[PDB]
């Protein structure tokens, strides 16, 4: 293989060897003919021209090649970019060996994090600086079928070494709450309503900025609403400085912004009174003319009634749905009558971004999907300003900076979105790049997100493309495009990758190393097969139609036990909990001298008495 | 550290699966030892007949030839008391010092050659010995550059085993009925593509001494004028034939049952591994590694050979061992031929 | 290289984000501007990222946002734009009857200023509402503010002096805070006290005035220090001393580092800089101070993000005008992107001279040749491959098209924005924080803690080059390189006293110190 | 030799050797030893093999059933419909049909 043209950025070969093509040797290790992941090199007396191939066969005149020039080597430095003489006829073109691999894919950095092994050979790992994965941004791009899941959190975990990274912060945006089991107890976890071990999400609504409320509680008001909203508003915050007295806090500086608490349920229950009650005598709707607060229900006619009736009404009913309890019903942040809690957004915010471990999982799961745009917009602009106005001290994002994982963004991060969220990622993108805060894009449809948004991201995760959409709107926004790596984007197995940014030295398509067994996300969903096969048992409805109309999911109804409650437990892995019923002792007391935990259950206590889990 | 065997099997079949490389084969004793037609071997080795000739031969005037010999050198083995009783033989006055008559030693080596030249001759068994079915791989694959095979035995089971399965083979004797020996046809080396040809470095028992002009001939196996001799020109002719084959770039030979105890061989193929770059040898060691230190050495100073054993494997002049190689011994070689050749 | 058509014939930067643009930008700027060569420099830098400022020390002045020990502070007066930038950048563009509204009442204002300030050749003939006189804010905010919601004691008439105040909040025309009225009820019994009649449709746009005149973020707009206006419409300073210090500073380089500024005006406010130089040194192309006597060059960053082919921005307009008219009144340009396929193509296709560095992909390769005057087979296929700090010079201001390896830089002068960096914070040890103390910065909307010291005296010597202490407060200071000062809280005299006579200024730093005292950096 | 998985490793050169693929290596490709995949029909070549499809996932991930009137989609989700909810392997199937 000798090259015998240049043509300024693609030499083009024409090998004598007659028929070697057959994993040429040297040194007992075998090397392949120029294959479509295979690097060149090109020895012009000194100096080491070096390249990757392209394209084989017939696209380059059969003995032509499309070799693409990448890099070149000074006196015996190092690995660099940019050459000083491309290669002319007469000299034979050798190829990088496995040693010589290893010299390009070497650095001298030890912020730099071996991440994996090449496809190639499993012994080179792809030295990747972790500086930039957090600093700059990230892009997690593929089919679903190519194992993204896996890959990420191998990716995550491998960051959060407590040895390697001691100050690391990682925020996970899961919204199919598919990563419990994926880091147990390495991460908390935070839900709407949460069963034995993860904590409950809560959100202080009076900490958000009053538009935010507009969009979210009182619907999008406009017009006289909304004035009145903003003098209610601003009256409750100057009602909360006079009663209480907070540092920072007065009558002279109130801003509209203002995170104090102000009574929202004594709100509601004054734009009902002045609505609905009628007053005793006519001419005057003095309030002790009258012909709770915390309870929704409410008590000539009143003249101060207003024009946002169904507004209020949309908030009433917002108070007393279930799903609305981690909107207006956090635990210490429990707003009285008269605006007081037994605890502040400082431990709030030390909750959250102040564990004891490096990576924290917050899981939106059980959310409303009426709002959901909002809620991620207040959850960022949350984190982004609590770690910039307090960016001076050493607890801010600077000092600790922080990495923020967005999963299916393409619906709320589109061409047209015009949502509150965009607008915060916009925001962190353009500025966090000092405040050091960090994002991350995972999705399956890459062909959705808007082109600059993701143009903007430092390092991007290839996994298997097949449409061509996908591969066009990626290679629209990398930068560095080698067609021995932007071909070969539909045929990866399941769990490689392609890595490309500023993380990695040399484009790497390596292999994302196996998270350690017992630890593989997946979210637990139920088996089609093995819940049919059962045969059929007798139902019983009532409790459903009972459960329904009470709105509760708890029923009125390891191997422990309780004789005066003839109910035997058994407990399956992943922390799942069962209730059989209807179980005399004897039974359950010969289960546990049978065998050891196992076989009798399924045998006798799996399809006789009704179970509850 | 550790080798896997998978890549090299695969890298074996893929160098096995193309015809543009040439292909050559030692068959050294080892492989014959392999295959027993009762309980024991068939035809022991070298060990084996030294032990019975020892064994069927006062017996104290022969023993002192042995130690004797063994005063300046290690346990002989046939070919040492050969050479031992050839070099006495060339002195007319050389027996004086053994003090045994003047022909006791010429009879004793005439029954040392009776003795080996019948107990070598035995015929193969079935056809599942190896023998065939390397005959049938060698069918298997329309080669157009003939494959070559070197063997330091002295029967003649493979060229049985070839014609068994019709495929033709060459040994540089043409003739039916007294095979004169050519020397033009080998020097020229213009021959057909499908004809292949089989090299004896040993000698074989067919092959006879006509004496008066020193010719030697083959044909119907007689008593008494045997060529068996392993060293004692044939000889070189063996040898420049083997070593202008080793230089051809990009060649491939493999090896069974050798043992790497012939320095000459060792010598020849260390000085053609260092001559041709592209050349290329597969040592296929038998046993454990550590009973060839003369392998190690021939691994650390030449590069282009790889030396794989049952317990340990130095490639590229790196020492190391398996990751848990069955192909050592004759019987998985064939095997592994044939299931390539399916 | 020549150097006149490098200048009137304007010129271009292109190359990948790998290839050190910066540090080529920086050589180049530094020796077009050598003090020995060129005494009468003049350059402006509009740098976006601020990774210039840090290339040149004291070579050059630098107007930041926030200034923490010599830097000035960027201040553009909000009377010196023009009615359509202000209402583009305050109200967001309002196309109602409320734009008429505010166009008098700015006419009003300035007509009151003219009036009671005298200003030389302006009178009331010769006044539009272009022209650059200052006038109070918050007296148009709250008269307008007070005119909407304010009701009138008695009905019929909604006069000023009908105010229906009940009482007890009077209100502050400086200040945010709005007066109180009694709320509007004509029923018997009570008085009978109505609305104003005479309120627009501007409440909203009013609020959001209000919400920008109390955000911290707007300083430099709507809180000039020199450029305040107070109620009667009297300034401390004057334009002149703006453009002074803008554009006739004793330094040749002036750099604009715009970082701090938000992410949503940042366009129109490199429009209104633009097109206050243009005009500045348009109109005066007579006198010694003018373009023509001494020509000014531009250099823009991040070209591809306001040049776009489709972009409505108002700096495209500006960068148009320069592009086509500069080459009469003597002001040059100097486009710098990563992403040529971005910019416009006929703006591009006009830049006399190309720098191309190396380019990756194939779309700014395309467009890099299909915006090119004069190609050589042979030089323009090495595009891909060029080493790293070297250029392909192309255009007119050159003999032939070369390619050079541009001269690097003087030690301590490399260009490279202050990021913070994220092995160091990672890598340390978590400590406490102080959640109470950021919240009540939160909420507050300042970045300046109250346990400051204020003017500790701090004594010469990771690197340490200067040292300060207090026994009364016992707060260790200690100021770092690159203008970084930290305040470290209540540590002990016999810490730093054993570090001021350590063998060298660090290490036991970074040992005992670093990462046991809360700071604070100022 | 142990089945068939999405995702190249790696690529041809030139001057290699294509094949066509024989019944049995169909059979190799489509079959698999999975529980959950149930038989719906055919493949249009070769009636021997089974088409093998998931039913945990369809029913749970989504589904969807697009094509012209006169094609029949009607006979079609009739027999998707019965294989699905066959008495023998699914005793306890529940489908709401919104006719």
């Given at each position: 293989?000798?090259?015998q ?9 024409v ?6 093509s057959?994993?040429k ?6 090397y ?6 295979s ?8 100096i ?13 005149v ?25 290669p002319?006829?007469g000299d034979?073109?050798?190829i ?6 290893k010299?390009?894919y070497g650095?001298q ?6 991440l ?5 050979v499993?012994?080179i790992?792809a030295?990747?600086n972790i500086?930039?994965?957090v ?7 593929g ?11 191998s990716?995550?975990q491998?960051i959060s ?27 908390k976890?935070?839900?709407v ?24 509680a ?6 006289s609403g909304?004035?009145?909203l ?10 909360t ?6 540092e920072?806090?007065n009558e ?11 009574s929202?349920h004594?709100?509601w ?27 929704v229900v ?5 003249n101060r009634?207003?024009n946002?009736r ?5 908030l009433?009913?917002?108070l ?13 942040w429990?707003?009285n009558?008269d605006g007081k809690?037994?605890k ?8 959250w ?6 990576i924290?999982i917050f899981?939106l799961?059980?959310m409303?999907?009426?709002?959901l ?33 967005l ?6 991060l589109?061409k047209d ?6 607008d ?6 353009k500025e966090?790049?000092?405040?050091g805060?960090?994002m991350?894009l995972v999705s399956?449809?890459?062909s959705?997100?808007d082109?600059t948004?993701?143009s ?8 298997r493309?097949?449409?061509s ?10 930068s560095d495009?080698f067609?021995?790596?932007m071909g ?5 197995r ?13 484009p790497?398509?390596?292999?994302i190393s ?14 089609v ?15 459903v ?5 009470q709105?509760?999911?708890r029923?009125?109804?390891?191997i422990?036990?309780?004789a ?8 399956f ?5 069962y ?6 002792e004897?039974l359950?007391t010969?289960?546990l001298?049978a065998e050891?935990h196992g076989?009798?259950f ?9 179970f509850?889990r | 550290?550790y ?7 695969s890298?074996l ?13 030692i068959?050294?004793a ?6 027993r037609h009762?309980?024991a071997?068939?035809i022991?080795?070298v ?5 019975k ?6 017996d ?24 031992y ?24 080596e ?10 070598v ?5 079935g056809?599942?010995t190896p023998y ?12 157009e550059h003939?494959?070559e095979?070197?063997?330091?035995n002295?029967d ?13 083979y060459?040994?540089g004797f043409v ?6 020996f050519?020397?033009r046809?080998?020097?020229?080396n213009?021959?057909?593509?499908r ?20 010719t ?11 060529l ?8 070189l002719?063996?040898?420049?034939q083997?070593?202008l084959?080793?230089?051809?770039p990009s ?9 790497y105890?012939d320095?000459h ?9 260092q001559?041709n ?7 296929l ?13 021939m691994?650390?100073?030449?590069s282009?050979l ?5 317990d340990?494997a130095?490639?590229?002049?790196k020492?190391?061992?398996?990751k848990?190689?069955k192909?050592?011994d ?5 095997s592994f031929?044939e299931?390539?050749?399916?």
């Amino acid at each position: 293989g000798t090259v015998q043209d240049v043509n300024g950025a693609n030499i083009r070969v024409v090998l004598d060897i007659n028929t070697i093509s057959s994993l040429k040797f040297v040194d007992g290790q075998g090397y392949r003919i120029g294959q479509i992941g295979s690097f060149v090199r090109i020895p012009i007396g000194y100096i080491n021209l070096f390249g990757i191939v392209s394209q084989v066969g017939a696209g380059a005149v059969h003995r032509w090649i499309s070799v693409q020039l990448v890099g070149e080597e000074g006196i015996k430095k190092e690995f660099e970019r940019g050459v000083s003489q491309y290669p002319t006829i007469g000299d034979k073109v050798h190829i990088v060996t496995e040693p010589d691999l290893k010299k390009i894919y070497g650095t001298q950095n030890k912020k730099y994090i071996s991440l994996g092994n090449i496809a190639s050979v499993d012994s080179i790992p792809a030295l990747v600086n972790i500086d930039t994965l957090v600093t700059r941004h990230s892009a997690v791009l593929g089919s679903t079928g190519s194992g993204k899941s896996t890959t990420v959190t191998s990716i995550l975990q491998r960051i959060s070494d407590m040895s390697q990274f001691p100050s690391a912060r990682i925020i996970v945006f899961d919204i199919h709450g598919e990563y419990a089991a994926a880091f147990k107890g390495k991460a908390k976890v935070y839900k709407v309503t949460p069963s034995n071990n993860e904590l409950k999400l809560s959100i202080p609504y009076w900490a958000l900025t009053c538009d935010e409320f507009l969009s979210v509680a009182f619907g999008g008001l406009e017009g006289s609403g909304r004035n009145a909203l903003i003098d209610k508003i601003y009256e409750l915050k100057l009602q909360t400085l006079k009663r209480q007295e907070y540092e920072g806090i007065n009558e002279d500086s109130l801003t509209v912004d203002t995170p104090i608490p102000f009574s929202i349920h004594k709100l509601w229950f004054d734009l009902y009174r002045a609505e609905i009650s009628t007053h005793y005598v006519q001419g005057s709707h003095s309030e002790e003319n009258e012909a709770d607060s915390l309870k929704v229900v409410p008590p000539y006619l009143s003249n101060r009634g207003k024009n946002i009736r169904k507004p209020l009404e949309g908030l009433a009913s917002l108070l007393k749905d279930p799903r609305y309890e981690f909107l207006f019903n956090a635990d210490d942040w429990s707003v009285n009558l008269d605006g007081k809690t037994n605890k502040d957004l400082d431990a709030l915010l030390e909750t959250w971004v102040g564990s004891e471990e490096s990576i924290s999982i917050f899981d939106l799961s059980g959310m409303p999907s009426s709002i959901l745009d909002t809620l991620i917009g207040i959850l960022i602009r949350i984190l982004y300003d609590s770690l910039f106005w307090s960016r001076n001290q050493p607890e801010g994002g600077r000092e600790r900076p922080l990495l923020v994982v967005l999963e299916e963004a393409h619906t709320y991060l589109g061409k047209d979105s015009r949502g509150i969220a965009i607008d915060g990622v916009r925001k962190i993108v353009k500025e966090g790049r000092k405040y050091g805060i960090g994002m991350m894009l995972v999705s399956q449809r890459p062909s959705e997100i808007d082109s600059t948004i993701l143009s903007q991201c430092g390092t991007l995760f290839a996994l298997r493309m097949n449409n061509s959409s996908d591969r066009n709107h990626v290679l629209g926004a990398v930068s560095d495009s080698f067609e021995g790596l932007m071909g070969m984007l539909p045929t990866l197995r399941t769990g490689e990758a392609i890595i490309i940014g500023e993380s990695v030295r040399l484009p790497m398509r390596t292999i994302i190393s196996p998270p350690p067994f017992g630890r593989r996300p997946d979210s637990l969903d139920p088996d089609v097969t093995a819940k049919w096969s059962n045969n059929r048992v007798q139902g019983d409805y009532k409790e459903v139609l009972t459960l329904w109309r009470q709105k509760k999911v708890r029923s009125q109804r390891s191997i422990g036990y309780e004789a005066d409650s003839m109910t035997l437990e058994i407990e399956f892995n992943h922390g799942l909990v069962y209730q059989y019923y209807d179980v005399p002792e004897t039974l359950h007391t010969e289960l546990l001298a049978a065998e050891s935990h196992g076989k009798f259950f399924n045998s006798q206590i799996k399809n006789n008495y009704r179970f509850s889990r | 550290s550790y080798y896997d065997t998978t890549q090299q099997l695969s890298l074996l079949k893929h160098v096995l699966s193309e015809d543009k490389r040439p292909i050559a084969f030692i068959i050294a004793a080892g492989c014959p030892v392999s295959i027993r037609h009762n309980d024991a071997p068939l035809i022991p080795d070298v060990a084996g007949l030294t032990r019975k000739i020892s064994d069927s031969f006062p017996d104290s005037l022969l023993m002192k030839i042995i130690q004797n010999l063994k005063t300046t050198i290690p346990n002989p083995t046939i070919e040492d008391i050969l050479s031992y009783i050839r070099l006495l033989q060339q002195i007319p006055m050389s027996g004086k010092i053994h003090d045994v008559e003047n022909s006791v030693i010429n009879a004793l080596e005439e029954s040392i050659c009776e003795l080996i030249e019948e107990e070598v001759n035995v015929d193969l068994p079935g056809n599942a010995t190896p023998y065939h079915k390397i005959a049938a791989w060698i069918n298997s694959i329309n080669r157009e550059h003939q494959v070559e095979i070197f063997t330091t035995n002295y029967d003649l089971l493979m060229e049985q085993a070839l014609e068994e399965l019709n495929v033709p083979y060459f040994d540089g004797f043409v003739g039916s009925k007294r095979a004169f020996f050519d020397i033009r046809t080998i020097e020229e080396n213009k021959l057909p593509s499908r004809w292949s040809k089989l090299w004896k470095l040993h000698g074989s028992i067919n092959w006879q001494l006509d004496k008066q002009t020193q010719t030697i001939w083959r044909g119907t196996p007689s008593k008494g004028c045997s060529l068996i001799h392993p060293s004692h020109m044939p000889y070189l002719v063996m040898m420049d034939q083997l070593k202008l084959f080793l230089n051809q770039p990009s060649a491939i030979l493999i090896t069974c049952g050798y043992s790497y105890k012939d320095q000459h061989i060792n010598e020849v193929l260390s000085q053609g591994l260092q001559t041709n770059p592209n050349a290329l040898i597969y040592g296929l060691q038998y046993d454990v590694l550590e009973n060839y230190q003369e392998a190690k050495d021939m691994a650390l100073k030449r590069s282009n050979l790889i030396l794989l054993a049952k317990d340990r494997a130095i490639i590229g002049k790196k020492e190391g061992e398996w990751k848990p190689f069955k192909l050592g011994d004759f019987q998985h070689l064939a095997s592994f031929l044939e299931e390539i050749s399916q």
